[PDB]
């Protein structure tokens, strides 16, 4: 039943908007697989601090496009040596955070293309010979989700390290016949492995082609979100207290203003994954007494599996107040 979309743009902002738009107009009838390629860019996780993750002056110098995605996780640098994939599907009860199930077909395709021993590790990365060639993230909204990931074929690894504040390319591990492909050919071969065919003509009717009504709405998302300075960089947090810890589920970085024993301002940054927006947690804490019992009580009704995957409510409250 799956369909596919090959994005034509080389702009990360248009490609993310396309994914956003396709998730928001998905039918249960057909899940999608998306493939997209873009020019030098950095993509921030949903709750990351732009100013701490990127060397902005260097990105500015080199014309590296900065944006922010809807999924959690960390910062990624992409260039024309990367292809990104996305599985857009109806969310089953167990599905969110199950990177093993969602990356299985990519691993199997890569194994078939000669990259044997490729495996999932650190929960959301794909490794080969102990080295990361892919990071993955998930987003869900209203029972629909995507899992999207990078595949480093011929990324400039030096540039990755320079613009962000063990990794590897796939090319050396693939069979000889796949070792001198264009990034487009690499993408197309992956696609063919996923649908278990020899040529694209065997699945041309499974392509979904973006209409002009689609393109118009995507254009609006780029203006309002993915190219929007307010969305990308966010407002400066007002704070005198910073609490940062690494948990099983990633880093949480909390910035607080406390006055007369009450929380007046709170900003939460991190690279955790989440089904729901962190803004709801912040809204519940504003004006609350800055003490464990009062903070816990304010968050009593929240299911923390929804807000911070693999970080407990107790951990979070202790972070805020210890």
Residues at the site binding ligand LPA, with contacts judged by CB under 6 A: 43, 69, 73-74, 76, 84, 124, 135-137, 148-150, 271
Chosen from Cl ion, ligand LPA, none, partner binding at 43 (C-beta under 5 to 8 Å by type): ligand LPA
DSSP string, 15-69: HHHHHHHHHHT-BTTB-EEEEE--SSEEEE-TT--HHHHB-HHHHHHHT-EEEE-
Closest to Cl ion by CB, 192 vs 254, is 254
**124 marked among binding-site residues:** yes
Closest to ligand LPA by CB, 241 vs 251, is 251
For the CA atoms of 149, 106, 24, 210, what is the dihedral angle to 10 degrees? Answer: 100
User: Residue 30 forms beta bridges with which residues?
Assistant: 27
| E-only strand ranges, 205-277 | 241-247, 250-259, 262-270
Closest to Cl ion by CB, 10 vs 276, is 276
Q: Which residue from 62, 64, 87, 86 is spatially nearest to 75, judged by alpha carbons? A: 64
Site for Cl ion in 246-305 (CB under 5 A): 304
Chosen from Cl ion, ligand LPA, none, partner binding at 110 (C-beta under 5 to 8 Å by type): none
Q: Can you read off the two tokens belonging to residue 263?
A: 């929380």
* Closest distance of CB 79 from ligand LPA, Å: 13
Chosen from Cl ion, ligand LPA, none, partner binding at 227 (C-beta under 5 to 8 Å by type): none
CA atoms of 23 and 25, how far apart (whole Å): 6
* Closest distance of CB 317 from Cl ion, Å: 10
Chosen from ligand LPA, Cl ion, none, partner binding at 270 (C-beta under 5 to 8 Å by type): none
Closest to ligand LPA by CB, 23 vs 321, is 23
Q: Which residue has the tokens 């078939």?
A: 112
The CB-nearest residue to ligand LPA is: 135
Q: Mapping DSSP to helix (H, G, I), strand (E, B) and coil, where does residue 140 land? A: strand
Q: Mapping DSSP to helix (H, G, I), strand (E, B) and coil, where does residue 44 land? A: strand
* Residues that bind Cl ion in the complex, under the rule CB under 5 A: 304, 313
Binding-site residue ranges for (R)-lipoate: 74, 124
């Amino acid at each position: 039943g799956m369909r596919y979309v090959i994005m034509q743009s080389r702009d990360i902002r248009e490609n993310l908007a396309t994914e956003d738009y396709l998730l928001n107009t998905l039918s249960f009838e057909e899940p999608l697989v998306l493939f997209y390629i873009q020019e030098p860019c950095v993509i921030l996780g949903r709750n990351q601090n732009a100013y701490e993750e990127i060397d902005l002056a260097y990105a500015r110098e080199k014309g590296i496009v900065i944006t922010r995605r809807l999924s959690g996780g960390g910062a990624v640098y992409d260039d024309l040596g990367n292809v990104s994939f996305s599985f857009v599907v109806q969310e089953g009860h167990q599905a969110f955070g199950d990177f093993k199930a969602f990356t299985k077909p990519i691993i199997e395709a890569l194994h078939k293309m000669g990259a044997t021993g490729a495996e999932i590790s650190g929960r959301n990365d794909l490794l080969i010979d102990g080295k990361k060639f892919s990071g993955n993230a998930m987003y869900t909204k209203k029972g629909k989700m995507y899992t999207h990931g990078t595949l480093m074929y011929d990324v400039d690894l030096a540039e990755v390290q320079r613009v962000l504040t063990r990794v590897t390319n796939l090319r050396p591990y693939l069979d000889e016949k796949y070792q001198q492909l264009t990034i487009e050919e690499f993408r197309n071969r992956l696609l063919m492995e996923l649908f278990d065919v020899e040529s694209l003509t065997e699945i041309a009717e499974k392509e979904y082609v973006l209409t002009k009504a689609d393109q118009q709405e995507i254009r609006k998302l780029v203006a309002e979100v993915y190219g929007n300075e307010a969305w990308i960089f966010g407002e400066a947090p007002k704070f005198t207290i910073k609490k940062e810890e690494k948990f099983k589920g990633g880093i949480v970085d909390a910035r607080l203003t406390v006055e007369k024993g009450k929380i007046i301002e709170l900003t939460i940054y991190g690279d955790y994954f989440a089904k729901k927006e962190t803004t709801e947690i912040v809204a519940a804490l504003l004006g609350v007494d800055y003490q464990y019992s009062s903070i816990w009580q304010a968050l009593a009704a929240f299911n923390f599996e929804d807000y911070f995957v693999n970080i407990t409510k107790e951990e979070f409250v202790h972070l805020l107040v210890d």
